C-alpha cells in the first residue's frame, strides 16, 4: 500500500525553495510532505525510526549529511524503505545519492577571480562540523596553489556579527585580500558594509562573492556576485527521484542541475 | 481517531520561522505538519476539500488571509474539521483566529518617525489584493492624517526591482519624503541601496524601516530599524491552539505575541 507522504526531518532554528521544487513535483502524483522538527540531535534518528517501523511515509529525504552521519547505518540497515540523499557522493556511501558539486563551484568562482588579477583571496566558511566542509577546503587548496594564489580561510556561525568580525579580520591583517568569498549572502552582505564603514570601495579595492543566491545579493550596495544553485530544480528532480524508488524502479546518482556564476558589480579586477 | 497531521497548503514560490514554531509544539504531542503545495488559484481549495473529505489530517491552518477568501465559507460549511486562521479579525468571520495587529503596529512606526521630527513620510508597499492592504493603509492615513504628517504610498511586487523602483519614484518628486516605510525587509535594502547610489544619506537625509525583520536588516549599510514580528511564537502559539481545537476545548481568539520595533542606525532626525 502507498501513504503518499515523502518524509523529512528540519532541523529546529533556501529549505523554503526545496520544498516549493519538491512540492511541484508530489502534486503532479497527489503525494503530500511529512514534516517534523528535531529539536536535538539524536531526535531525526529517533523519528526516522518510527517512520521506518510504523511505515508512516513512502520515502525519506535526507539532507545535510555529516562526515560519519548516523542515519546512512540506519537507512542501509533498513533498505525496505526508499530514501535519497542530498549531498556530495563520498558522504552518501551507496545510498540514492542527488549530487552536489562544490569543488566545481569552487573552480568556477576562481577562476573568476583569477581572471580579474586576485592573487591574493580569502574564504569566510561555516562551521568546520559541516560534511561540506573539508570538500570546499580541499578544493579550495588545490586550485589557488595551483594558481599561485595565496588563500586564507576563518570559520564562523553563518550568523551577520560573525561574517563582519571575520571581515575586519581578514581586511585588517597585511598582506590584506583583495577578495573575499562568504559561504552565505547575510555573511557576504555583512562584509560589504564592513567594507563600507572602513572606506574599503566595491569593488575597486575588494571583490566581494557570496556562495548561494538570494534577492538580498540584488538589493545590495553595489549588487553581489553571487554563485547560485538551482534550488527550485533540485527540488523537483529529488521528489522524481524518490517517486521513482516508490514506484520499484532502478535509480543511479544524479547531478544536480548546474550551478551559475551570476556576475554583479560587486567582482572587478584586483587594486 | 487522530491522524496526529495538522494540514498546511503553502503556494508555489516568514514561514520557515512559522514552521520551526509550530513544529517546537507539534513535537510535544509527537503530531507532524503535511504540506502540500497550490499551484494555482483554486488549487488550494481542492486540496482542503479533499483533506476534509477523507479527514486525512486532524486540523487545518490557514494562512494570508485576503477578503472575501473562499477558504472561509469552506471552514464554515465544514465544522467537524479544526481550523485556526492567522490573520486580523475582521477577515476571518467567526473562525479561530490567532489574531495580528497591524494597526497598532502602524502606530508604532509612525510615532517613532513623529518623534524625529518628520513631517513628510512615504510607504512602499506590496500589492493591493493582501488582505491587510486596507487595514494597514486605513491606520496609516488615519494616524499620519491626525498628527499632520504628509503621507503617500505605491504598491509594488515585493520584489528588489520594484522597491527600487518606487524608491527613485519616491526620491525624486518633490517634496521628497524624509522617511520611508517598506513592508519587507528586501525593498528597504533595494531603497538603502537606491538612496546611497542617489547621494542621500541614511539616516541623515533619509530614514528607512522595514515592516519585518531578518539578519538583511542587522547586515546592511547602515543597519535598518525593523518592526519585528515574533513568527517563532506565533508559530508555537498557533500550534497549540490547534491542539486545543482538536482536544475538544473552547478557543477563544488570541492575541499574537507582541512585536517590537527594533532601533537601528537607519532612523534619525528629519533633515
Known sequence: ????????????????????????????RDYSLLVRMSMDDDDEVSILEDWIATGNVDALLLLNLEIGDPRIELMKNNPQMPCLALADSSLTSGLPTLMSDDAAASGTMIRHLALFGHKNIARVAGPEELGHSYIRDAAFSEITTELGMRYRCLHTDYTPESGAEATKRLLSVEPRPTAIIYDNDVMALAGESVASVKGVRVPEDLSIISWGDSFMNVAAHPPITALSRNILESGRLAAQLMLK?????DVENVEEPPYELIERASTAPAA
Request: charged share 25%; net charge negative; hydrophobic share 40%.
Open 1 to 28: 500500500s502507498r501513504t503518499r507522504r515523502i518524509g523529512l526531518v528540519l532541523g529546529y532554528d533556501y529549505i523554503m525553495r526545496l520544498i516549493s521544487g519538491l512540492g511541484s513535483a508530489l502534486e503532479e
Open 245 to 249: 524508488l516508490i514506484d520499484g524502479e
